[PDB]
Amino acid sequence: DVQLQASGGGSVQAGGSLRLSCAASGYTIGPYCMGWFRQAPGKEREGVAAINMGGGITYYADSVKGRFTISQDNAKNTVYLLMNSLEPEDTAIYYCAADSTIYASYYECGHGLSTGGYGYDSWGQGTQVTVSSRR
Amino acid sequence: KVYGRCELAAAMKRLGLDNYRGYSLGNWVCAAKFESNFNTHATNRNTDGSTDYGILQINSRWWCNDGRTPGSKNLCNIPCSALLSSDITASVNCAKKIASGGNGMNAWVAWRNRCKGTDVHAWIRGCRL
Ligand code: NA
Ligand code: NA
Ligand code: NA
Numbered sequence: 001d002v003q004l005q006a007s008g009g010g011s012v013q014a015g016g017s018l019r020l021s022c023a024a025s026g027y028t029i030g031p032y033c034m035g036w037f038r039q040a041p042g043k044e045r046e047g048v049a050a051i052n053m054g055g056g057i058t059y060y061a062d063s064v065k066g067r068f069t070i071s072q073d074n075a076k077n078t079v080y081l082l083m084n085s086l087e088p089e090d091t092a093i094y095y096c097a098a099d100s101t102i103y104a105s106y107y108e109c110g111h112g113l114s115t116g117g118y119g120y121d122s123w124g125q126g127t128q129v130t131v132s133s134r135r
Numbered sequence: 136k137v138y139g140r141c142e143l144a145a146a147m148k149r150l151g152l153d154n155y156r157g158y159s160l161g162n163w164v165c166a167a168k169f170e171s172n173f174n175t176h177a178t179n180r181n182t183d184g185s186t187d188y189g190i191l192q193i194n195s196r197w198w199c200n201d202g203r204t205p206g207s208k209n210l211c212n213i214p215c216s217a218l219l220s221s222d223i224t225a226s227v228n229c230a231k232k233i234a235s236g237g238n239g240m241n242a243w244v245a246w247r248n249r250c251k252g253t254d255v256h257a258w259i260r261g262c263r264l
Binding site: 029052054055056057100101102103104105106 | 170179181182183184185187191192193194196197198207208210230233236237238241242243244245
């Protein structure tokens, strides 16, 4: 009965920036991981960024390294995805997701991120991001 | 202490892990093999400053307290050093709590990878229990 509530998104001109946010509620313990996955109409779903809530270590798809940054407020089981230098190819429905499993041994949240979302059991409804071309 | 395969199966059975939450004994033996090579002293430091302790490599950011992990939890309510004893009791009791977390043994990456879905009974074959 946990809920992931996302904010931010919308339209922006290429070269611009957007910050998405996602708050996890209903958890007593966890989540262990929080991240963002995106889906563009004619493409494979892509794991964009993830973070170990315990520790703050981050992971990124090669396609966004140096442009996007994920961080956590922690104090409030909330994570942020700061997206700079957006390109039209970044247009997609962005989804906040979480892995509620409290792992025994250390687990890298980037694993499920790069392998089809494995382990990410809770999902937001998706936020549209449209990056329009320059004039 | 480095346990022998059957020696560990025996101790875990004694401690009640055989069919604990539906996981037959070999699941736990297979998990220890790949997590720690049956070594109760195994420790592995992680980039987040946490450490995995013992036979089942239990993590200091969530399950035990080692005092080096800044703002961590201690869900099993024990010092991590307790997880390094020759006596696997503390590790087993904590592992029970971990497997009651909601995802069963999936909490152990190595179990999920090397044991889940295999013929786990092979891990206790040839042992007297
Ligand atoms: Na999960
Ligand atoms: Na491990
Ligand atoms: Na701790």
